[PDB]
Motif scaffolding. Structure first.
Motif, PDB file in Angstrom:
ATOM      1  N   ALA A 103       0.825  -1.203   0.000  1.00 48.67           N
ATOM      2  CA  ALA A 103       0.000   0.000   0.000  1.00 48.67           C
ATOM      3  C   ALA A 103       0.861   1.256   0.000  1.00 48.67           C
ATOM      4  O   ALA A 103       0.566   2.218  -0.717  1.00 48.67           O
ATOM      5  CB  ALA A 103      -0.943  -0.008   1.203  1.00 48.67           C
ATOM      6  N   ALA A 104       1.935   1.261   0.793  1.00 49.36           N
ATOM      7  CA  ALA A 104       2.827   2.414   0.830  1.00 49.36           C
ATOM      8  C   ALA A 104       3.519   2.623  -0.511  1.00 49.36           C
ATOM      9  O   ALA A 104       3.658   3.761  -0.974  1.00 49.36           O
ATOM     10  CB  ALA A 104       3.858   2.244   1.946  1.00 49.36           C
ATOM     11  N   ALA A 105       3.963   1.537  -1.148  1.00 44.62           N
ATOM     12  CA  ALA A 105       4.611   1.661  -2.451  1.00 44.62           C
ATOM     13  C   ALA A 105       3.643   2.192  -3.501  1.00 44.62           C
ATOM     14  O   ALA A 105       3.999   3.067  -4.301  1.00 44.62           O
ATOM     15  CB  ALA A 105       5.186   0.313  -2.883  1.00 44.62           C
ATOM     16  N   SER A 109       3.615   7.430   4.806  1.00 45.19           N
ATOM     17  CA  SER A 109       3.304   7.271   3.388  1.00 45.19           C
ATOM     18  C   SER A 109       1.897   7.761   3.077  1.00 45.19           C
ATOM     19  O   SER A 109       1.669   8.398   2.042  1.00 45.19           O
ATOM     20  CB  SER A 109       3.468   5.808   2.975  1.00 45.19           C
ATOM     21  N   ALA A 110       0.937   7.467   3.958  1.00 43.97           N
ATOM     22  CA  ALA A 110      -0.428   7.938   3.751  1.00 43.97           C
ATOM     23  C   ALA A 110      -0.495   9.461   3.773  1.00 43.97           C
ATOM     24  O   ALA A 110      -1.182  10.071   2.945  1.00 43.97           O
ATOM     25  CB  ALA A 110      -1.356   7.342   4.807  1.00 43.97           C
ATOM     26  N   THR A 111       0.211  10.091   4.714  1.00 44.82           N
ATOM     27  CA  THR A 111       0.224  11.550   4.776  1.00 44.82           C
ATOM     28  C   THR A 111       0.879  12.149   3.538  1.00 44.82           C
ATOM     29  O   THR A 111       0.409  13.162   3.004  1.00 44.82           O
ATOM     30  CB  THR A 111       0.943  12.018   6.042  1.00 44.82           C
ATOM     31  N   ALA A 112       1.973  11.541   3.070  1.00 49.61           N
ATOM     32  CA  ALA A 112       2.626  12.023   1.857  1.00 49.61           C
ATOM     33  C   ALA A 112       1.704  11.901   0.652  1.00 49.61           C
ATOM     34  O   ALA A 112       1.623  12.818  -0.173  1.00 49.61           O
ATOM     35  CB  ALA A 112       3.928  11.258   1.620  1.00 49.61           C
ATOM     36  N   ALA A 172      -1.789  14.476  -3.248  1.00 43.12           N
ATOM     37  CA  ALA A 172      -3.093  14.594  -3.890  1.00 43.12           C
ATOM     38  C   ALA A 172      -3.650  16.003  -3.744  1.00 43.12           C
ATOM     39  O   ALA A 172      -4.238  16.545  -4.686  1.00 43.12           O
ATOM     40  CB  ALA A 172      -4.063  13.568  -3.304  1.00 43.12           C
ATOM     41  N   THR A 173      -3.478  16.611  -2.568  1.00 44.89           N
ATOM     42  CA  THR A 173      -3.936  17.984  -2.373  1.00 44.89           C
ATOM     43  C   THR A 173      -3.190  18.953  -3.287  1.00 44.89           C
ATOM     44  O   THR A 173      -3.800  19.847  -3.887  1.00 44.89           O
ATOM     45  CB  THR A 173      -3.766  18.394  -0.910  1.00 44.89           C
ATOM     46  N   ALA A 204      -6.175  -3.132   6.321  1.00 47.15           N
ATOM     47  CA  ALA A 204      -7.233  -2.308   6.893  1.00 47.15           C
ATOM     48  C   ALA A 204      -7.573  -1.144   5.968  1.00 47.15           C
ATOM     49  O   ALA A 204      -7.729  -1.324   4.761  1.00 47.15           O
ATOM     50  CB  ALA A 204      -6.823  -1.795   8.265  1.00 47.15           C
ATOM     51  N   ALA A 205      -7.688   0.054   6.546  1.00 48.91           N
ATOM     52  CA  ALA A 205      -7.979   1.248   5.763  1.00 48.91           C
ATOM     53  C   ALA A 205      -6.801   1.699   4.912  1.00 48.91           C
ATOM     54  O   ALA A 205      -6.973   2.593   4.076  1.00 48.91           O
ATOM     55  CB  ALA A 205      -8.414   2.387   6.686  1.00 48.91           C
ATOM     56  N   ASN A 206      -5.617   1.114   5.110  1.00 51.18           N
ATOM     57  CA  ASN A 206      -4.460   1.490   4.303  1.00 51.18           C
ATOM     58  C   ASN A 206      -4.691   1.178   2.830  1.00 51.18           C
ATOM     59  O   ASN A 206      -4.373   1.994   1.958  1.00 51.18           O
ATOM     60  CB  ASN A 206      -3.209   0.776   4.816  1.00 51.18           C
ATOM     61  N   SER A 207      -5.253   0.004   2.533  1.00 49.53           N
ATOM     62  CA  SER A 207      -5.562  -0.334   1.148  1.00 49.53           C
ATOM     63  C   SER A 207      -6.598   0.620   0.570  1.00 49.53           C
ATOM     64  O   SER A 207      -6.487   1.042  -0.587  1.00 49.53           O
ATOM     65  CB  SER A 207      -6.049  -1.779   1.055  1.00 49.53           C
ATOM     66  N   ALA A 208      -7.613   0.973   1.363  1.00 53.11           N
ATOM     67  CA  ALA A 208      -8.654   1.875   0.883  1.00 53.11           C
ATOM     68  C   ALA A 208      -8.083   3.249   0.548  1.00 53.11           C
ATOM     69  O   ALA A 208      -8.379   3.814  -0.512  1.00 53.11           O
ATOM     70  CB  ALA A 208      -9.766   1.991   1.925  1.00 53.11           C
ATOM     71  N   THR A 209      -7.253   3.801   1.438  1.00 51.95           N
ATOM     72  CA  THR A 209      -6.695   5.122   1.168  1.00 51.95           C
ATOM     73  C   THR A 209      -5.675   5.079   0.037  1.00 51.95           C
ATOM     74  O   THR A 209      -5.580   6.036  -0.739  1.00 51.95           O
ATOM     75  CB  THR A 209      -6.081   5.727   2.436  1.00 51.95           C
ATOM     76  N   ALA A 210      -4.924   3.980  -0.094  1.00 50.88           N
ATOM     77  CA  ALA A 210      -4.016   3.846  -1.228  1.00 50.88           C
ATOM     78  C   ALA A 210      -4.785   3.809  -2.542  1.00 50.88           C
ATOM     79  O   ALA A 210      -4.393   4.463  -3.517  1.00 50.88           O
ATOM     80  CB  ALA A 210      -3.159   2.590  -1.070  1.00 50.88           C
ATOM     81  N   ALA A 211      -5.889   3.059  -2.584  1.00 47.12           N
ATOM     82  CA  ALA A 211      -6.701   3.003  -3.795  1.00 47.12           C
ATOM     83  C   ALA A 211      -7.316   4.360  -4.111  1.00 47.12           C
ATOM     84  O   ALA A 211      -7.359   4.775  -5.275  1.00 47.12           O
ATOM     85  CB  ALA A 211      -7.788   1.940  -3.650  1.00 47.12           C
TER      86      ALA A 211
END
Lengths: 34, 34, 34
Positions: free
Chosen positions: A7-9, B4-7, B12-13, C1-8
């Motif tokens: 997911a991070a990648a 990674s999610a924050t980045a 995206a923003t 978890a939500a990591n896949s959702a936010t990555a998508a």
């Protein structure tokens, strides 16, 4: 955390692609305006 | 990864902001041409 | 978890931004300038 690593990648790749698209879009817009 | 999610979110923003700027430039060009 | 959702979600937003920038920000502006 293989799923988290994937997911991070994917998020990093998407972020890089979005940043590149944004920079080319802004460059084209400013070149056309100027 | 939280970092990674924050980045990805901030990229995206930034991409959305640049796309809005490009849309504004395109709208100005369309108003000029039309 | 939500990591896949936010990555998508980030990947989809990046793809949409790239698609919009390829045509509306570059092709359209070039069309007006040409």
């Amino acid at each position: 955390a293989a799923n988290s690593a994937t997911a991070a990648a994917t998020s990093a790749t998407a972020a890089q692609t979005a940043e590149t698209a944004a920079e080319t879009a802004q460059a084209a817009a400013e070149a056309v305006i100027a």
